[PDB]
Enzyme design. Structure first.
Site, PDB file in Angstrom:
ATOM      1  CB  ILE A 174    -114.193 -25.470 -90.746  1.00  0.00           C
ATOM      2  CG1 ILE A 174    -113.605 -26.566 -89.884  1.00  0.00           C
ATOM      3  CG2 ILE A 174    -114.175 -26.028 -92.134  1.00  0.00           C
ATOM      4  CD1 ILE A 174    -114.268 -27.903 -90.136  1.00  0.00           C
ATOM      5  N   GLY A 175    -111.875 -23.390 -88.916  1.00  0.00           N
ATOM      6  CA  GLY A 175    -111.518 -22.957 -87.578  1.00  0.00           C
ATOM      7  C   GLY A 175    -110.397 -23.789 -86.986  1.00  0.00           C
ATOM      8  CB  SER A 176    -107.447 -23.195 -85.163  1.00  0.00           C
ATOM      9  OG  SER A 176    -106.965 -22.878 -86.452  1.00  0.00           O
ATOM     10  N   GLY A 177    -108.345 -24.084 -82.832  1.00  0.00           N
ATOM     11  CA  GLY A 177    -108.684 -24.377 -81.454  1.00  0.00           C
ATOM     12  C   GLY A 177    -107.492 -24.795 -80.619  1.00  0.00           C
ATOM     13  CG  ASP A 208    -112.573 -29.970 -69.757  1.00  0.00           C
ATOM     14  OD1 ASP A 208    -113.229 -29.015 -69.279  1.00  0.00           O
ATOM     15  OD2 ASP A 208    -111.504 -29.810 -70.398  1.00  0.00           O
ATOM     16  N   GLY A 247    -103.865 -28.538 -83.468  1.00  0.00           N
ATOM     17  CA  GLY A 247    -104.130 -28.778 -84.875  1.00  0.00           C
ATOM     18  C   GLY A 247    -105.375 -28.135 -85.454  1.00  0.00           C
ATOM     19  CB  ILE A 248    -105.996 -25.841 -88.321  1.00  0.00           C
ATOM     20  CG1 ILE A 248    -107.204 -25.027 -88.817  1.00  0.00           C
ATOM     21  CG2 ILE A 248    -105.375 -26.500 -89.515  1.00  0.00           C
ATOM     22  CD1 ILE A 248    -106.861 -24.069 -89.996  1.00  0.00           C
ATOM     23  CB  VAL A 249    -110.505 -28.988 -88.177  1.00  0.00           C
ATOM     24  CG1 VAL A 249    -111.599 -29.734 -88.920  1.00  0.00           C
ATOM     25  CG2 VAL A 249    -110.132 -29.705 -86.890  1.00  0.00           C
TER      26      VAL A 249
HETATM   27  C1  LIG Z   1    -119.907 -25.915 -92.879  1.00  0.00           C
HETATM   28  N1  LIG Z   1    -119.531 -26.611 -91.643  1.00  0.00           N
HETATM   29  C2  LIG Z   1    -118.923 -25.837 -90.562  1.00  0.00           C
HETATM   30  O1  LIG Z   1    -118.714 -24.663 -90.652  1.00  0.00           O
HETATM   31  C3  LIG Z   1    -118.516 -26.568 -89.293  1.00  0.00           C
HETATM   32  C4  LIG Z   1    -118.365 -27.880 -89.158  1.00  0.00           C
HETATM   33  C5  LIG Z   1    -117.623 -28.232 -87.852  1.00  0.00           C
HETATM   34  N2  LIG Z   1    -117.153 -29.579 -87.595  1.00  0.00           N
HETATM   35  N3  LIG Z   1    -117.749 -30.602 -88.100  1.00  0.00           N
HETATM   36  C6  LIG Z   1    -117.045 -31.687 -87.705  1.00  0.00           C
HETATM   37  C7  LIG Z   1    -115.906 -31.220 -86.857  1.00  0.00           C
HETATM   38  C8  LIG Z   1    -114.845 -31.842 -86.163  1.00  0.00           C
HETATM   39  C9  LIG Z   1    -113.909 -31.068 -85.443  1.00  0.00           C
HETATM   40  N4  LIG Z   1    -112.650 -31.786 -85.077  1.00  0.00           N
HETATM   41  C10 LIG Z   1    -112.443 -33.165 -85.576  1.00  0.00           C
HETATM   42  C11 LIG Z   1    -112.327 -33.410 -86.944  1.00  0.00           C
HETATM   43  F1  LIG Z   1    -112.347 -32.354 -87.807  1.00  0.00           F
HETATM   44  C12 LIG Z   1    -112.156 -34.697 -87.431  1.00  0.00           C
HETATM   45  C13 LIG Z   1    -112.111 -35.786 -86.560  1.00  0.00           C
HETATM   46  C14 LIG Z   1    -112.232 -35.566 -85.184  1.00  0.00           C
HETATM   47  C15 LIG Z   1    -112.397 -34.257 -84.722  1.00  0.00           C
HETATM   48 CL1  LIG Z   1    -112.529 -33.966 -83.000  1.00  0.00          CL
HETATM   49  C16 LIG Z   1    -114.016 -29.639 -85.529  1.00  0.00           C
HETATM   50  C17 LIG Z   1    -113.074 -28.667 -84.763  1.00  0.00           C
HETATM   51  N5  LIG Z   1    -113.649 -28.029 -83.763  1.00  0.00           N
HETATM   52  C18 LIG Z   1    -114.025 -28.884 -82.855  1.00  0.00           C
HETATM   53  C19 LIG Z   1    -113.246 -28.014 -81.847  1.00  0.00           C
HETATM   54  C20 LIG Z   1    -112.754 -27.324 -83.127  1.00  0.00           C
HETATM   55  C21 LIG Z   1    -115.137 -29.040 -86.134  1.00  0.00           C
HETATM   56  C22 LIG Z   1    -116.031 -29.827 -86.835  1.00  0.00           C
HETATM   57  C23 LIG Z   1    -117.771 -27.282 -86.939  1.00  0.00           C
HETATM   58  S1  LIG Z   1    -118.122 -25.724 -87.762  1.00  0.00           S
END
Ligand SMILES: CNC(=O)c1cc(-n2ncc3cc(Nc4c(F)cccc4Cl)c(CN4CCC4)cc32)cs1
Length: 346
Positions: free
Chosen positions: A26-29, A145, A32-34
């Site tokens: 669902i993207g990186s940043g 921040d 670590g990717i998520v």
């Molecule tokens: C169909 N849905 C979508 O497309 C989307 C849904 C999301 N979404 N929802 C929850 C979430 C959480 C984070 N990180 C994270 C995590 F994953 C687990 C525990 C703690 C944390 Cl901090 C990120 C990453 N981002 C944040 C900066 C990069 C994106 C996230 C955004 S788009």
């Protein structure tokens, strides 16, 4: 037999508990990717973040530790709460990765910023950012921040702040987005609660303008953008500057600064109905109180929540939540690995 399985996601290996199915990026940043997943145990969609060897250096170490500890000090619907934390490593020795799990959201705030939004949604997102911030501050946490890439929203317009701000150098290509940082932060001043109001003002401003208010290669460029638009701050602001920073800001060209109708003209606002005409002037009024260089003149979190643009959403059960470890010392990799490991399994 094993509780975990592994799947390649984009480029990274996710080793997750078997309850989590159908992982997809669902993207990186930053670190670590998520991935999005279905949690078969709770029957709901979650987001899973991999911290890869978060102890590898102090920057990654400090904030992984900090965020695991701070998670337990807040409990509020506009602030992240974790559903699960796990490592697939069996011992401190083998320990490598941390996985964090939370509710799956719909979008990052950056995407929402690029949309034309009515006043009801803009004011509601801002209200929620202000409620979260207020929760943080009441818990002794001043963010410093806040930025849209760490804020996420659901389709029902609900909003969560995902990180806890500032406590440096990383050999990675990763790059820190600084455009939303207050002058106190840009110029190394003291700060208090309303350091974060500035960042809310930069977000609000960018929602209307659809351009970063204060871009720049680094603080030099950024400061220039602040004074070009808001004008040189008063002498009273100058007296708060450390002697060397003070000499630098006083020797920049003096700028008159543009009025706030000029900085956010009426063309940027829906203004077809009387209702929208009034909301426009309320939006600009609030902007003019948030985007104030001198924190002693910048509106507070509590007064911003009483602003007419915002308080149509005010609910006492949303602003005043019940409030509730400190280690920023320099540690080696080893100390940090055990400190994080212990928090992972308590
Ligand atoms: C169909 N849905 C979508 O497309 C989307 C849904 C999301 N979404 N929802 C929850 C979430 C959480 C984070 N990180 C994270 C995590 F994953 C687990 C525990 C703690 C944390 Cl901090 C990120 C990453 N981002 C944040 C900066 C990069 C994106 C996230 C955004 S788009």
């Amino acid at each position: 037999d094993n509780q975990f399985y592994s799947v390649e996601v984009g480029d990274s290996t996710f080793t997750v508990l078997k309850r989590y199915q159908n992982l997809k990026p669902i993207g990186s940043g930053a670190q670590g990717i998520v991935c999005a997943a279905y949690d078969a145990v709770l029957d709901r969609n979650v987001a899973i973040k991999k911290l890869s060897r978060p102890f590898q250096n102090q920057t990654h170490a400090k904030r992984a530790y900090r965020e695991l500890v701070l998670m337990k000090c807040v409990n509020h619907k506009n602030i992240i709460s974790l559903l699960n934390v796990f490592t697939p490593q069996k011992t401190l020795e083998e320990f490598q990765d941390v996985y964090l799990v939370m509710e799956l959201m719909d979008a990052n705030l950056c995407q929402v910023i690029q949309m034309e939004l009515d006043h009801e949604r803009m004011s509601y997102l801002l209200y929620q950012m202000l409620c979260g911030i207020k929760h943080l501050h009441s818990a002794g946490i001043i963010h410093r921040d806040l930025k849209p890439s760490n804020i996420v929203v659901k389709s029902d317009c609900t909003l969560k702040i995902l990180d806890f701000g500032l406590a440096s150098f990383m050999m990675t290509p990763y790059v820190v987005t600084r455009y939303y940082r207050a002058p106190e932060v840009i110029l190394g001043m003291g700060y208090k609660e309303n350091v974060d109001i500035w960042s809310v003002g930069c977000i609000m401003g960018e929602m209307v303008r659809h351009k970063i208010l204060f871009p720049g290669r680094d603080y030099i460029d950024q400061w220039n953008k602040v004074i070009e638009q808001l004008g040189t701050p008063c002498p009273e602001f100058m007296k708060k500057l450390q002697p060397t920073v003070r000499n630098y800001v006083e020797n920049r060209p003096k700028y008159a600064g543009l009025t706030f109708p000029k900085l956010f003209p009426d063309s940027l606002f829906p203004a077809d109905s009387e209702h929208n005409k009034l909301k426009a002037s309320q939006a600009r009024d609030l902007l003019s109180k948030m985007l104030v260089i001198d924190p002693a003149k910048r509106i507070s979190v509590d007064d911003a929540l009483q602003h007419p643009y915002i308080n149509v959403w005010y609910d006492p059960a949303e602003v005043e939540a019940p409030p509730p470890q400190l280690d920023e010392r320099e540690h080696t990799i080893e100390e940090w690995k055990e400190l994080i490991y212990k928090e992972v399994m308590n």
